[PDB]
Amino acid sequence: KPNYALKFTLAGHTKAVSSVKFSPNGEWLASSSADKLIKIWGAYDGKFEKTISGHKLGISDVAWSSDSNLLVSASDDKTLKIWDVSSGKCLKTLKGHSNYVFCCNFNPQSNLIVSGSFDESVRIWDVKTGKCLKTLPAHSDPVSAVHFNRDGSLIVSSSYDGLCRIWDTASGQCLKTLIDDDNPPVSFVKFSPNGKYILAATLDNTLKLWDYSKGKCLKTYTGHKNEKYCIFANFSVTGGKWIVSGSEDNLVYIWNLQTKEIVQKLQGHTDVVISTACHPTENIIASAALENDKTIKLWKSDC
């Protein structure tokens, strides 16, 4: 079992945090907030680095390019922005969604961005030109998450319509729809590091690990509370193989991926834990709580 202990508590955002992400190179944590700001923090010391401003309304998600040089953000102002993190420059503003942009990610090459929106579509954008390449009529409710697979040939999307869908990046065809005899809103999805599986959160207090190739649920993780908020889940891969998630009871939950047992609950936040992220090389978790709490915490484990 891991032994995560609180190391640093960070604060600075003035409204609800929506997402935290560690840079792939391990140096930084990025956070996004309803305060319209992206903030960069030192991954190892929690030291505030800088604000990156420019969005006109709140931000729902931020994501790093695979070389850690760029960030993309998704905002209620109906744009995505691509940022050069080192300089803070806005490289491109991506206009095309007809309503709030809720989620975003680069492909592993980091030449494409995928976005999902309240407009119920998924869009695929060229990073260098900032132009939209494809629009997919993906869902019948807002799109909560979008993620490329290991080689970038597939995109997984999720929606409050209860569907997880897998799209062919090149053709835009809807290849698969995952259904578990029910339809609770899906608030998050992502491919596993090896690309074989899809991890999905639904607003019935459940995380599910799906076999992509088979279209079948392999494992479920339960014990936490998640009926309202868009709470990501993480694969922790630096030490023991865990699933990590925030929870609406103010705790971070950590499960054994294989056995599905809870192995730790992290106590310290005083409001919903809206987001978590796992450091790429060290056994470090970042957690962020909602607006009654307003802190981001860095926790470290020996394994």
Q: Using CA atoms, how far apart are residues 198 and 156, in angstroms rounded to an integer?
A: 8
CB count in 10 Å sphere of residue 263:
17
Residue 70 CA to chain centroid, in angstroms? Answer: 16
For 29, which DSSP code? Answer: E
Q: Using CA atoms, how far apart are residues 269 and 27, in angstroms rounded to an integer?
A: 24
Q: Using CA atoms, how far apart are residues 195 and 270, in angstroms rounded to an integer?
A: 35
Task: Give Cα separations from 105 to 29, 169, 189, 249, 276 (angstroms).
Answer: 16, 13, 12, 28, 16
Beta strand 143-148 pairing with 174-178: unpaired
Mapped onto helix, strand or coil, the DSSP state of residue 263 is strand
Q: Using CA atoms, how far apart are residues 123 and 113, in angstroms rounded to an integer?
A: 8
The structural domains of the chain, ordered by start, are: 1-303 (2.130.10.10)
Q: Evaluate the CA torsion angle 289, 291, 296, 297 in order and state its sign.
A: negative
Structure tokens of 195? 């690309």
Resolution of the experimental structure, in angstroms: 1.5
294 Cβ contact partners less than 8 Å away, ≥ 6 residues apart? 11, 13, 14, 17
Most distant CA pair in the chain, distance: 49
* Whether 244 contacts 190, CB under 8 Å: no
Q: Using CA atoms, how far apart are residues 41 and 96, in angstroms rounded to an integer?
A: 30
Core vs surface per residue 186-214: b (16+ CB within 10 A) or e: bbbbbbbeeebbbbbbbbebbbbbbebee
Structure tokens of 37? 């700001």
Contacts 24+ apart (CB under 8 A), 82-91: 82/113, 82/127, 82/130, 83/38, 83/52, 85/23, 85/28, 85/30, 85/40, 85/52, 88/50, 88/52, 90/54, 91/130
> Among candidates 170, 178, 165, 132, which has minimal Cα distance to 151?
170
> With DSSP H G I counted as helix, E B as strand and the rest as coil, what are the percentages for the chain, rounded to 5?
0, 50, 50
* Whether 102 contacts 117, CB under 8 Å: yes
The HSE-up count of residue 200 (CA atoms within 13 Å, CB side) is 35
* Whether 289 contacts 269, CB under 8 Å: yes
The HSE-up count of residue 278 (CA atoms within 13 Å, CB side) is 25
Q: Using CA atoms, how far apart are residues 28 and 14, in angstroms rounded to an integer?
A: 20
Q: Using CA atoms, how far apart are residues 246 and 223, in angstroms rounded to an integer?
A: 11
Amino acid letter, 246: G
* Whether 273 contacts 293, CB under 8 Å: no
Residue located via tokens 């391990």: 26
> Among candidates 58, 45, 61, 110, which has minimal Cα distance to 84?
110
Structure tokens of 32? 């996004």
Q: Using CA atoms, how far apart are residues 277 and 190, in angstroms rounded to an integer?
A: 13
* Whether 35 contacts 56, CB under 8 Å: no
Q: What angle do CA 125, 171, 149 make, to 5 degrees?
A: 65
Residue located via tokens 């919903």: 272
* Whether 260 contacts 221, CB under 8 Å: yes
Q: Using CA atoms, how far apart are residues 25 and 243, in angstroms rounded to an integer?
A: 21
End-to-end Cα distance, the chain: 8
